[PDB]
Amino acid sequence: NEVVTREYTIHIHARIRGIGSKKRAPRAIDEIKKFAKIQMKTNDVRVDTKLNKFIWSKGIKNVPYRVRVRLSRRRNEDEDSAQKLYTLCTYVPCTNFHGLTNVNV
RNA sequence: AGGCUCGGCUGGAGCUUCCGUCAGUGCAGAUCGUAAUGGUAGUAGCAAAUAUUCAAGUUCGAUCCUUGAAGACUGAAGUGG
What we know:
Layout: E1 4-10, H1 12-15, H2 24-40, E2 45-47, H3 49-55, E3 67-75, E4 85-91, E5 103-104
Parallel strand pairs: 2-4
Antiparallel strand pairs: 1-3, 1-5, 3-4
The chain binds one RNA strand through residues 21-23, 25-26, 29, 46-53, 55-57, 59-60.
């Protein structure tokens, strides 16, 4: 119940509406982290470098409108950490977003 | 009245009455000299030169140090040698 994996679609276009040109990709990263916090209920969120690469794939201002991510809540191997769980976000290549919904994995 | 005496506390080595006489002898000011300190005030402000992000390392501690990946800039009359 605590170690789980789900596939989500994030409407980055809606999330970063109105953000300045030189902050759109850095803001999209933060919005992905916020989405992971809200949906997976973990304060510790890590973004995979390939997801970062995709978000930055078209420069700093022309962020992709949608992204298909896989949020995986897992146990924090470090027993010294304040919290026992953390969520890792990974990039799921996707070309057609029509009809896709939140999916358990 | 100028000022003075005593009490209490601090301090640790000098001070004092009266008689003459002497003076570098009394401060609120001089945009006074010098030293220190306020309100202003946690205020004005820290806005030129396009721009940073992700993961990790080290550390008590990382936006800023180091490694890798990405994205940009100088653009050879350069932000190079």
